[PDB]
Coordinates of C-alpha atoms in Angstrom, one line a residue:
Chain W
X33 CA 119.6 107.3 80.0
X34 CA 118.6 104.7 82.6
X35 CA 115.3 104.0 84.2
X36 CA 114.6 105.3 87.7
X37 CA 112.2 103.4 90.0
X38 CA 110.8 104.1 93.4
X39 CA 111.8 101.0 95.3
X40 CA 111.3 101.7 99.1
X41 CA 109.0 103.8 101.1
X42 CA 108.4 104.6 104.7
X43 CA 107.4 107.5 106.9
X44 CA 105.7 108.7 110.1
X45 CA 102.8 110.9 109.5
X46 CA 100.1 112.5 111.7
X47 CA 98.1 109.9 113.8
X48 CA 100.0 107.2 111.8
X49 CA 103.0 105.4 113.2
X50 CA 103.8 103.8 109.9
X51 CA 102.6 103.6 106.3
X52 CA 100.1 100.8 106.9
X53 CA 98.4 102.9 109.6
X54 CA 98.5 105.9 107.4
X55 CA 96.7 104.0 104.6
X56 CA 94.2 102.6 107.1
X57 CA 93.4 106.2 108.2
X58 CA 93.3 107.5 104.6
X59 CA 90.9 104.9 103.2
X60 CA 88.7 104.8 106.4
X61 CA 88.2 108.6 106.3
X62 CA 89.8 109.1 109.7
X63 CA 90.7 112.8 110.3
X64 CA 94.4 112.9 111.3
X65 CA 94.1 116.6 112.4
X66 CA 93.6 116.6 116.2
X67 CA 92.4 119.2 118.7
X68 CA 94.6 118.0 121.6
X69 CA 97.4 120.2 123.1
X70 CA 100.5 118.2 122.9
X71 CA 103.1 120.5 121.3
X72 CA 101.7 123.7 122.8
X73 CA 98.5 124.8 124.6
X74 CA 95.5 124.7 122.4
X75 CA 94.4 128.2 121.3
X76 CA 97.7 129.8 122.2
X77 CA 98.2 133.3 120.9
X78 CA 95.0 132.9 118.9
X79 CA 96.4 130.0 116.9
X80 CA 94.0 127.3 115.5
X81 CA 93.2 124.5 117.9
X82 CA 94.0 121.8 115.3
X83 CA 97.2 120.5 113.7
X84 CA 98.5 117.3 112.3
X85 CA 100.8 116.0 115.1
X86 CA 102.9 112.8 115.2
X87 CA 102.1 110.3 117.9
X88 CA 105.5 110.4 119.6
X89 CA 108.8 112.4 119.0
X90 CA 110.8 110.9 121.9
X91 CA 111.8 107.4 120.8
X92 CA 115.1 106.5 119.2
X93 CA 117.1 103.2 119.1
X94 CA 120.3 104.9 119.8
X95 CA 122.4 101.8 120.3
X96 CA 121.7 100.6 116.7
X97 CA 122.7 103.9 115.0
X98 CA 125.8 104.5 117.1
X99 CA 124.6 107.5 119.1
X100 CA 125.6 107.8 122.7
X101 CA 123.1 108.8 125.4
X102 CA 124.4 112.4 125.6
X103 CA 124.5 112.9 121.9
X104 CA 121.0 111.4 121.4
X105 CA 119.6 113.7 124.1
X106 CA 121.0 116.6 122.1
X107 CA 119.9 115.5 118.6
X108 CA 117.0 116.9 116.7
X109 CA 113.9 114.7 116.8
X110 CA 113.7 115.1 113.0
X111 CA 117.1 113.5 112.6
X112 CA 116.3 110.5 114.9
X113 CA 113.0 109.8 113.2
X114 CA 114.6 110.3 109.8
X115 CA 117.4 107.8 110.5
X116 CA 114.8 105.2 111.6
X117 CA 112.6 106.0 108.6
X118 CA 115.5 105.8 106.2
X119 CA 116.5 102.3 107.5
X120 CA 112.9 101.3 107.2
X121 CA 112.7 102.6 103.6
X122 CA 115.9 100.9 102.4
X123 CA 114.8 97.5 103.7
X124 CA 111.2 97.9 102.4
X125 CA 112.5 97.4 98.8
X126 CA 114.3 94.2 99.8
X127 CA 117.7 95.8 99.6
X128 CA 119.9 95.0 102.5
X129 CA 121.4 98.3 103.8
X130 CA 124.9 96.8 104.0
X131 CA 124.8 96.0 100.3
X132 CA 124.8 99.8 99.5
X133 CA 127.7 100.6 101.9
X134 CA 130.6 102.3 100.0
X135 CA 128.5 102.9 96.9
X136 CA 127.8 106.3 95.3
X137 CA 124.3 106.6 96.8
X138 CA 123.2 110.2 97.6
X139 CA 121.1 111.8 100.3
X140 CA 118.8 114.7 99.4
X141 CA 116.7 115.9 102.3
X142 CA 114.1 118.6 102.2
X143 CA 113.8 120.6 105.5
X144 CA 112.7 124.1 106.4
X145 CA 113.1 124.1 110.2
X146 CA 115.9 124.0 112.7
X147 CA 114.0 124.9 115.9
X148 CA 116.0 122.4 118.1
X149 CA 119.2 124.2 117.5
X150 CA 117.6 127.5 118.5
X151 CA 116.2 125.8 121.6
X152 CA 119.4 124.1 122.8
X153 CA 121.8 126.9 122.1
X154 CA 119.8 129.6 124.0
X155 CA 122.0 129.5 127.2
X156 CA 125.6 130.4 126.3
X157 CA 126.8 129.4 129.8
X158 CA 125.7 125.8 129.8
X159 CA 125.4 124.6 126.2
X160 CA 127.1 121.5 124.6
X161 CA 129.2 121.6 121.5
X162 CA 127.9 118.4 120.1
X163 CA 124.4 120.0 120.0
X164 CA 125.4 121.6 116.6
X165 CA 126.4 118.2 115.2
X166 CA 123.0 116.8 115.9
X167 CA 120.9 119.9 115.1
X168 CA 122.7 121.8 112.2
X169 CA 120.4 121.5 109.2
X170 CA 123.3 120.4 107.0
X171 CA 123.6 117.3 109.3
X172 CA 120.1 116.1 108.5
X173 CA 121.7 114.3 105.5
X174 CA 125.4 114.1 106.5
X175 CA 124.4 111.9 109.4
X176 CA 122.5 109.6 107.1
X177 CA 125.5 109.3 104.8
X178 CA 127.8 108.8 107.8
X179 CA 125.7 105.9 109.2
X180 CA 124.8 104.2 105.9
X181 CA 128.3 104.9 104.4
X182 CA 127.1 106.6 101.2
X183 CA 129.7 108.3 99.0
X184 CA 127.3 110.3 96.9
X185 CA 126.2 113.9 97.3
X186 CA 124.6 114.8 100.7
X187 CA 122.6 117.9 100.4
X188 CA 119.8 119.7 102.3
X189 CA 117.3 121.9 100.4
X190 CA 114.7 124.3 101.6
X191 CA 112.8 125.3 98.3
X192 CA 110.1 127.0 100.4
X193 CA 107.6 124.2 101.0
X194 CA 108.3 122.3 97.8
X195 CA 111.4 120.8 99.2
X196 CA 110.5 117.1 99.2
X197 CA 109.6 117.1 95.5
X198 CA 112.7 119.2 94.8
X199 CA 114.9 116.6 96.5
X200 CA 113.1 113.9 94.6
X201 CA 113.7 115.7 91.3
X202 CA 117.4 116.2 92.1
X203 CA 117.8 112.6 93.0
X204 CA 116.0 111.6 89.7
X205 CA 118.5 113.9 87.8
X206 CA 121.4 112.3 89.6
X207 CA 120.3 108.7 89.0
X208 CA 119.3 109.5 85.4
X209 CA 122.8 110.7 84.5
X210 CA 124.4 107.6 86.1
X211 CA 126.1 109.6 88.8
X212 CA 124.3 107.9 91.7
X213 CA 123.4 104.2 91.6
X214 CA 120.7 105.0 94.2
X215 CA 119.4 107.8 96.3
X216 CA 117.6 108.5 99.6
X217 CA 115.1 111.3 99.4
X218 CA 113.4 112.4 102.6
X219 CA 111.4 115.3 104.0
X220 CA 110.9 116.2 107.7
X221 CA 108.7 118.8 109.4
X222 CA 108.0 119.0 113.1
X223 CA 106.0 121.8 114.9
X224 CA 107.7 122.9 118.1
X225 CA 107.8 126.7 118.2
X226 CA 104.4 128.5 118.2
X227 CA 106.1 131.6 116.9
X228 CA 106.3 130.1 113.4
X229 CA 102.5 129.4 113.6
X230 CA 101.9 133.0 114.7
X231 CA 104.0 134.2 111.7
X232 CA 102.0 132.0 109.3
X233 CA 98.8 133.3 110.8
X234 CA 100.0 136.9 110.3
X235 CA 100.9 136.3 106.7
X236 CA 97.3 135.2 106.1
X237 CA 97.7 131.5 105.2
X238 CA 96.4 129.5 108.1
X239 CA 92.7 128.6 108.3
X240 CA 90.7 129.8 111.4
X241 CA 89.0 126.4 111.4
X242 CA 92.2 124.4 111.2
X243 CA 91.1 122.4 108.2
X244 CA 92.7 122.3 104.8
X245 CA 89.4 122.2 102.8
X246 CA 90.7 122.0 99.2
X247 CA 88.7 122.2 96.0
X248 CA 85.9 123.7 98.1
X249 CA 84.0 126.9 98.1
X250 CA 85.0 127.7 101.8
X251 CA 88.7 127.5 101.4
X252 CA 90.4 129.8 104.0
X253 CA 93.8 128.3 104.8
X254 CA 95.8 125.1 105.6
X255 CA 96.5 123.3 108.8
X256 CA 100.1 122.9 109.7
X257 CA 101.1 119.3 110.3
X258 CA 104.2 117.3 111.1
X259 CA 105.6 114.4 109.1
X260 CA 108.7 112.4 108.3
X261 CA 108.9 110.4 105.0
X262 CA 111.8 108.8 103.2
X263 CA 111.8 107.3 99.7
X264 CA 114.5 105.1 98.1
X265 CA 115.3 105.5 94.4
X266 CA 117.4 103.1 92.3
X267 CA 118.2 102.2 88.7
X268 CA 115.9 99.5 87.5
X269 CA 118.8 96.9 87.5
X270 CA 119.0 97.2 91.3
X271 CA 115.4 97.5 92.4
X272 CA 113.7 94.3 93.7
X273 CA 110.3 95.9 94.4
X274 CA 109.1 98.6 92.0
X275 CA 106.3 100.9 93.2
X276 CA 106.5 102.9 90.0
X277 CA 108.8 104.5 87.4
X278 CA 109.5 108.3 87.2
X279 CA 109.0 109.2 83.5
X280 CA 110.0 112.9 84.0
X281 CA 110.6 115.3 86.8
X282 CA 111.3 119.1 86.5
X283 CA 111.3 122.5 88.1
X284 CA 110.8 126.2 87.5
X285 CA 110.2 129.4 89.4
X286 CA 107.2 131.7 88.8
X287 CA 109.5 134.7 88.5
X288 CA 108.2 138.3 88.8
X289 CA 104.5 138.8 89.5
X290 CA 102.5 141.9 89.9
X291 CA 100.5 140.4 92.8
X292 CA 103.6 139.9 94.9
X293 CA 106.1 137.2 96.1
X294 CA 103.4 135.0 97.7
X295 CA 100.9 134.9 94.8
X296 CA 100.9 131.8 92.5
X297 CA 101.0 132.2 88.8
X298 CA 99.2 129.4 87.1
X299 CA 100.7 130.0 83.7
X300 CA 104.1 128.9 85.0
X301 CA 102.7 125.7 86.4
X302 CA 100.9 124.9 83.2
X303 CA 104.2 125.5 81.3
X304 CA 106.0 123.1 83.7
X305 CA 103.4 120.4 83.2
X306 CA 103.3 120.7 79.4
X307 CA 107.0 120.8 79.0
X308 CA 107.5 117.8 81.3
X309 CA 104.9 115.6 79.6
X310 CA 106.1 116.7 76.1
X311 CA 109.8 115.9 76.9
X312 CA 108.7 112.6 78.5
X313 CA 106.7 111.6 75.4
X314 CA 103.5 110.9 77.4
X315 CA 100.2 112.0 75.8
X316 CA 97.8 113.9 78.0
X317 CA 95.1 111.3 77.6
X318 CA 97.2 108.7 79.4
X319 CA 97.0 110.6 82.7
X320 CA 94.4 109.2 85.1
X321 CA 94.9 111.0 88.4
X322 CA 96.4 114.3 89.3
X323 CA 97.7 115.0 92.8
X324 CA 97.1 118.7 93.0
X325 CA 98.8 120.8 95.7
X326 CA 95.5 121.4 97.4
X327 CA 96.6 123.8 100.0
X328 CA 93.0 125.0 100.4
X329 CA 93.7 128.6 99.8
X330 CA 91.2 131.1 98.3
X331 CA 93.5 132.1 95.4
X332 CA 96.0 129.3 95.0
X333 CA 93.5 126.6 94.4
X334 CA 91.7 128.3 91.4
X335 CA 95.0 129.2 89.8
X336 CA 96.4 125.6 90.2
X337 CA 93.2 124.0 89.0
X338 CA 92.9 126.3 85.9
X339 CA 96.5 125.6 85.1
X340 CA 96.0 121.9 85.3
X341 CA 92.8 122.1 83.2
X342 CA 94.6 124.0 80.5
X343 CA 97.7 121.7 80.6
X344 CA 96.0 118.3 80.7
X345 CA 92.2 118.5 80.3
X346 CA 92.4 120.5 77.0
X347 CA 91.4 117.6 74.7
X348 CA 90.8 114.5 76.8
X349 CA 87.3 113.1 76.6
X350 CA 87.5 111.3 79.9
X351 CA 87.4 113.2 83.2
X352 CA 90.7 113.5 85.1
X353 CA 90.5 112.5 88.7
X354 CA 91.9 115.0 91.2
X355 CA 92.7 114.9 94.9
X356 CA 94.9 116.2 97.7
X357 CA 96.4 114.3 100.7
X358 CA 96.2 117.6 102.7
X359 CA 92.4 117.2 103.3
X360 CA 93.3 114.2 105.5
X361 CA 96.6 115.1 107.3
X362 CA 97.0 118.8 106.8
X363 CA 99.9 120.5 105.1
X364 CA 103.5 119.6 106.1
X365 CA 105.4 122.5 104.5
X366 CA 108.8 120.8 103.6
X367 CA 107.4 117.3 103.3
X368 CA 104.2 118.0 101.3
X369 CA 105.5 116.2 98.2
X370 CA 106.5 113.0 100.0
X371 CA 103.1 112.7 101.7
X372 CA 101.4 113.0 98.4
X373 CA 103.8 110.4 96.8
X374 CA 103.2 108.0 99.7
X375 CA 99.4 108.4 99.3
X376 CA 99.6 107.8 95.5
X377 CA 101.9 104.8 95.8
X378 CA 99.8 103.2 98.6
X379 CA 96.6 103.8 96.6
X380 CA 98.2 102.1 93.6
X381 CA 99.4 99.2 95.6
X382 CA 96.0 98.6 97.3
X383 CA 94.1 99.3 94.0
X384 CA 91.9 102.1 95.4
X385 CA 92.2 105.9 95.5
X386 CA 92.1 107.3 99.0
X387 CA 89.0 109.6 99.3
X388 CA 89.4 113.3 99.9
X389 CA 87.7 114.8 102.9
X390 CA 85.9 118.1 103.4
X391 CA 84.6 118.4 99.9
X392 CA 80.9 119.4 99.8
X393 CA 80.5 122.1 97.0
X394 CA 82.9 123.1 94.2
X395 CA 84.5 126.5 94.2
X396 CA 82.7 128.5 91.6
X397 CA 85.9 130.0 90.2
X398 CA 87.0 126.7 88.8
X399 CA 84.9 125.8 85.7
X400 CA 86.4 122.3 85.4
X401 CA 84.9 121.1 88.7
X402 CA 81.5 122.6 87.8
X403 CA 81.8 120.7 84.5
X404 CA 82.8 117.0 84.3
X405 CA 86.4 117.6 83.0
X406 CA 87.8 117.3 86.5
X407 CA 86.4 115.0 89.1
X408 CA 87.3 115.1 92.8
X409 CA 87.7 111.8 94.6
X410 CA 85.1 112.1 97.4
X411 CA 84.8 108.3 97.9
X412 CA 86.9 105.2 97.1
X413 CA 87.4 104.4 93.4
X414 CA 89.1 101.4 91.7
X415 CA 92.2 102.1 89.7
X416 CA 91.7 101.9 85.9
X417 CA 95.4 102.3 85.0
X418 CA 97.4 105.2 83.8
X419 CA 100.1 107.7 84.5
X420 CA 99.9 109.7 87.8
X421 CA 101.0 113.3 88.3
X422 CA 102.2 114.9 91.5
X423 CA 102.9 118.6 91.7
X424 CA 104.1 120.6 94.8
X425 CA 104.2 124.4 94.9
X426 CA 106.0 126.5 97.5
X427 CA 104.9 130.0 98.7
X428 CA 108.3 131.3 97.7
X429 CA 107.6 130.7 94.1
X430 CA 109.1 127.3 93.3
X431 CA 107.3 124.5 91.4
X432 CA 107.9 120.8 91.0
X433 CA 106.1 118.1 88.9
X434 CA 106.6 114.3 88.6
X435 CA 105.1 111.9 86.1
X436 CA 104.8 108.4 87.5
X437 CA 104.0 105.2 85.6
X438 CA 102.4 102.6 87.9
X439 CA 104.0 99.2 88.2
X440 CA 101.5 96.6 86.9
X441 CA 103.1 93.2 87.3
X442 CA 100.4 90.4 87.4
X443 CA 101.0 87.7 90.0
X444 CA 103.0 84.7 88.6
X445 CA 101.2 81.7 87.3
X446 CA 101.3 78.6 89.6
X447 CA 104.6 76.7 89.5
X448 CA 105.4 73.1 90.6
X449 CA 107.7 74.4 93.3
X450 CA 105.0 76.6 94.8
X451 CA 103.6 73.9 97.0
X452 CA 107.1 73.0 98.2
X453 CA 107.8 74.2 101.8
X454 CA 110.1 77.2 102.1
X455 CA 112.3 78.6 104.8
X456 CA 111.9 82.1 106.3
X457 CA 114.5 83.7 108.6
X458 CA 114.1 87.0 110.5
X459 CA 116.2 89.3 112.6
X460 CA 115.2 92.1 115.0
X461 CA 116.4 94.3 117.8
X462 CA 114.0 92.6 120.2
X463 CA 112.1 89.3 120.1
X464 CA 109.0 91.4 119.2
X465 CA 110.4 92.3 115.8
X466 CA 111.4 88.7 115.0
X467 CA 107.9 87.5 116.0
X468 CA 106.3 90.2 113.9
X469 CA 108.3 89.2 110.8
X470 CA 107.6 85.5 111.3
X471 CA 103.9 86.0 111.8
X472 CA 103.6 88.2 108.7
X473 CA 105.5 85.7 106.7
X474 CA 103.2 83.0 108.0
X475 CA 100.2 84.9 106.9
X476 CA 101.6 85.1 103.4
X477 CA 103.1 81.7 102.9
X478 CA 102.2 81.6 99.2
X479 CA 104.0 84.9 98.2
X480 CA 107.5 83.8 96.9
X481 CA 108.6 87.4 96.3
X482 CA 107.7 88.6 99.7
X483 CA 109.5 85.7 101.4
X484 CA 112.6 86.2 99.3
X485 CA 112.7 89.9 100.1
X486 CA 112.2 89.2 103.8
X487 CA 115.1 86.7 103.6
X488 CA 117.4 89.2 101.9
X489 CA 117.0 91.6 104.8
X490 CA 117.6 89.0 107.5
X491 CA 121.4 88.9 107.1
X492 CA 122.6 91.3 109.7
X493 CA 125.5 90.7 112.2
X494 CA 124.3 89.7 115.6
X495 CA 126.0 92.8 117.1
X496 CA 123.4 95.1 115.4
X497 CA 120.4 92.7 115.9
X498 CA 121.0 90.3 118.8
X499 CA 117.8 88.3 118.2
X500 CA 116.9 85.8 115.4
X501 CA 114.3 83.2 114.5
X502 CA 113.2 80.9 111.6
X503 CA 109.9 79.5 110.6
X504 CA 109.5 76.7 108.0
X505 CA 106.5 77.3 105.8
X506 CA 104.2 74.7 104.2
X507 CA 104.9 71.9 106.8
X508 CA 102.3 70.3 109.1
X509 CA 104.8 70.5 112.0
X510 CA 105.2 74.2 111.4
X511 CA 106.0 76.5 114.3
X512 CA 108.3 79.5 114.7
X513 CA 111.4 79.3 116.9
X514 CA 113.3 82.3 118.3
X515 CA 116.4 82.8 120.4
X516 CA 119.1 85.3 121.2
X517 CA 122.2 84.9 119.0
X518 CA 125.4 85.1 121.1
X519 CA 128.1 87.5 120.1
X520 CA 131.3 86.2 118.5
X521 CA 132.1 84.3 115.4
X522 CA 131.7 80.6 115.3
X523 CA 133.6 78.1 113.2
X524 CA 131.5 75.9 110.8
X525 CA 132.7 72.3 111.0
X526 CA 131.5 69.4 108.8
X527 CA 131.2 65.7 109.6
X528 CA 130.6 62.9 107.2
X529 CA 128.9 59.7 108.4
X530 CA 130.0 56.2 107.8
Chain R
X869 CA 113.9 99.1 120.7
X870 CA 112.0 102.1 121.9
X871 CA 112.2 101.5 125.7
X872 CA 114.0 104.8 126.5
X873 CA 112.8 108.4 126.3
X874 CA 114.8 111.2 124.8
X875 CA 114.7 115.0 125.3
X876 CA 112.4 116.9 122.9
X877 CA 112.2 120.7 123.3
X878 CA 109.1 122.0 125.0
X879 CA 107.0 125.1 124.3
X880 CA 108.7 127.1 127.1
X881 CA 112.2 126.7 125.6
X882 CA 111.5 129.5 123.1
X883 CA 111.2 133.3 123.7
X884 CA 107.8 134.7 124.7
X891 CA 116.8 145.3 132.3
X892 CA 116.3 148.1 129.8
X893 CA 119.6 149.4 128.3
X894 CA 119.7 152.9 126.9
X895 CA 122.7 154.1 124.8
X896 CA 123.5 157.8 125.0
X897 CA 125.2 158.7 121.8
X898 CA 126.1 162.4 121.5
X899 CA 127.3 162.2 117.8
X900 CA 125.8 164.5 115.2
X901 CA 123.6 161.9 113.6
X902 CA 122.3 160.5 116.9
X903 CA 119.0 161.9 118.2
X904 CA 120.5 162.7 121.6
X905 CA 122.8 165.4 120.1
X906 CA 121.2 168.1 122.2
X907 CA 122.8 166.7 125.3
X908 CA 126.1 168.3 124.1
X909 CA 124.6 171.7 125.0
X910 CA 124.4 170.7 128.7
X911 CA 128.0 171.7 129.6
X912 CA 128.8 172.5 133.2
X913 CA 132.4 173.4 134.4
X914 CA 133.5 172.8 130.7
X915 CA 132.4 169.2 130.8
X916 CA 129.4 167.4 129.3
Chain F
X98 CA 110.7 147.7 95.1
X99 CA 110.8 146.8 98.8
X100 CA 108.6 149.0 101.0
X101 CA 110.3 150.4 104.1
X102 CA 108.4 148.2 106.5
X103 CA 109.3 145.1 104.5
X104 CA 112.9 146.4 104.3
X105 CA 113.4 146.6 108.1
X106 CA 112.1 143.0 108.7
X107 CA 114.4 141.7 105.9
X108 CA 117.5 139.5 106.6
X109 CA 120.7 141.5 105.9
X110 CA 122.0 138.6 104.0
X111 CA 119.2 139.0 101.4
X112 CA 119.6 142.8 101.4
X113 CA 123.3 142.5 100.5
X114 CA 122.8 139.6 98.2
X115 CA 120.4 141.5 95.9
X116 CA 122.9 144.2 95.4
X117 CA 125.8 141.8 94.9
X118 CA 123.9 139.7 92.4
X119 CA 123.0 142.8 90.4
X120 CA 126.7 143.9 90.5
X121 CA 127.8 140.4 89.4
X122 CA 125.3 140.3 86.4
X123 CA 126.4 143.7 85.2
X124 CA 130.1 142.9 86.0
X125 CA 130.0 140.4 83.1
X126 CA 128.9 143.1 80.6
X127 CA 125.3 141.7 80.4
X128 CA 122.2 143.8 81.0
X129 CA 120.2 142.1 83.8
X130 CA 117.1 142.6 81.6
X131 CA 118.2 140.3 78.8
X132 CA 117.9 137.4 81.3
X133 CA 114.4 138.4 82.3
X134 CA 111.9 135.6 81.5
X135 CA 114.7 133.1 80.7
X136 CA 115.1 129.7 82.5
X137 CA 118.1 131.1 84.5
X138 CA 118.4 129.4 87.9
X139 CA 119.6 130.5 91.3
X140 CA 121.6 128.4 93.8
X141 CA 122.4 130.0 97.2
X142 CA 124.5 128.4 99.9
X143 CA 123.5 129.6 103.4
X144 CA 123.9 128.1 106.8
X145 CA 122.3 130.6 109.2
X146 CA 118.8 132.0 109.8
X147 CA 119.6 134.2 112.8
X148 CA 117.5 137.1 111.6
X149 CA 114.3 134.9 111.5
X150 CA 114.9 133.8 115.1
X151 CA 115.3 137.5 116.2
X152 CA 112.2 138.7 114.4
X153 CA 110.0 135.9 115.8
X154 CA 110.7 136.2 119.5
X155 CA 107.6 138.3 120.6
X156 CA 104.4 136.8 119.3
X157 CA 102.5 139.9 120.6
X158 CA 104.3 142.3 118.3
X159 CA 106.0 140.2 115.6
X160 CA 104.9 140.8 112.0
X161 CA 104.4 138.3 109.3
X162 CA 106.5 140.0 106.7
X163 CA 109.6 138.5 108.4
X164 CA 108.6 135.1 107.1
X165 CA 109.0 136.3 103.5
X166 CA 112.0 138.4 104.1
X167 CA 113.9 136.1 106.5
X168 CA 113.1 132.5 105.5
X169 CA 116.1 130.5 104.3
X170 CA 114.3 129.6 101.0
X171 CA 113.7 133.2 100.3
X172 CA 117.4 133.8 100.0
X173 CA 117.0 132.5 96.4
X174 CA 113.3 133.0 95.7
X175 CA 113.6 136.7 96.2
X176 CA 116.3 136.9 93.6
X177 CA 114.3 134.8 91.2
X178 CA 111.3 137.0 91.8
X179 CA 113.1 140.3 91.3
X180 CA 115.2 139.3 88.3
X181 CA 112.3 137.2 86.8
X182 CA 114.2 133.9 86.6
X183 CA 112.2 130.9 85.6
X184 CA 114.9 128.3 86.3
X185 CA 115.5 126.3 89.5
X186 CA 115.9 128.4 92.7
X187 CA 117.1 126.3 95.6
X188 CA 118.9 127.1 98.9
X189 CA 121.6 124.5 99.7
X190 CA 122.5 123.9 103.3
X191 CA 125.7 121.8 103.4
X192 CA 128.1 123.5 105.8
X193 CA 131.5 124.9 104.5

């Protein structure tokens, strides 16, 4: 087998345009569930007034991704934001997207909604054929493969709310068996039709207060939220930046249950955890943090926590930290796993665990919380070091679990060439992007790896990115220069002086 | 480059005269209508 | 074991797929019970959720059972639940 590493990362989550804003909201305790009526009138059909909603769903750089104005107008917002997030994620790891073109990279996308196709195709008299191409759920990954020229599998999975982690597990399986040299895993969920919220309310899952209060005595339901997240996986030989290493990922279904289809069975989850960490050869003590599903339900939370306690906390003498990203941004059904993965990776990178909100008293049914075996992160904590676990469970009955080993690479010791001035080159759609890259590179003049990774992603033909600019670092006469690169190839002539 | 604005479905794009079928077959509930025969026609 | 109210709000695809799956398991000479509790998996390829769109068009009278019986993911989770399959249960979406 070959190592699998999470290289890139990017997404657009509630009240967070990018991952940096998402982390700033997470650490600062900002509540990303809002009471404004953007998608639909607040309080409609008795629905909760709160939901995690993205900032904007109507922005798309169509010219770059080769979508004509008519096609873009008839494309699902999920797909547009997912294309943008995928390009962001591939370049985050320092991998130039054109370097993967024609390879066997695969696209696994976890989605559970196709509301745009239903909205566009309502009028038979005046509908457009290309609406299906941009809205068909199978196209949520086929379009990514088409643009990025990936020859690997291109699938879309539902998995009933555990879809993002299911796609992550499938990509891990593909890369592990050497079938795919890389993989793009993404999950997208956007709330457009109030009828789905009404259905979820009828089933008895949503919370009247619109808050996903997990690990708490007053757990009623979760708050539906939007979100688009894409993650890049690669074999270790290809990854430039390594956020972590996937030690083992698995799956299993609860099967028959006397309670019904929508009642979790903690024994199956415990079996999944134990089997995964026994096959991966990782002792339970090594675990430091567990990313519980944390949907804030009255029955699911006790079952999940008791299963976790039996699986991991059976013998360990140190308390196991627990937390849920859904106390901050709500619960995106298809993309729940990717949000948790983003939170965990960002917390590892910044060295602190993002605190969990809406935790005042522990639910009496969970004995671990009342005791000290399990400790909920109610305020920022430093990272001691250890394996991290993320598990996502769907109301259909599916389960997923991933064991992550954090990447701990100490900064390199000073070298003689460190003080030498370096060159930084940037490319962007508009001068704003080039200026942003140059300024950020200036603020980190001493980070050789960051500068090299930025340079690797600056070699794009002027047709795609018609602006450019350099900035020499470490020089007294240092100032960025930018200008618009003309189209058309130019011969490179040499002259030797006398 | 996010200068433009693209269509995103609104809340009104989704659902929020009466046709009655008179089936006189045996299984159908309107079978009694076959007893209203005038001039030898139903 | 589907109650009549749940049966009506159930996607016809799932209704026929349950029967077809049982017929396929027995077709091989195997008793569908010997697979109960095993790590057998289910992979279903579907590309249409028309029934869900029809059952969720009137918020005043729509019922929440349609979510369980008409969701795309349930086209495999229902089979896993009835036959007690502990293996992976996904619902692929690639068209054709």
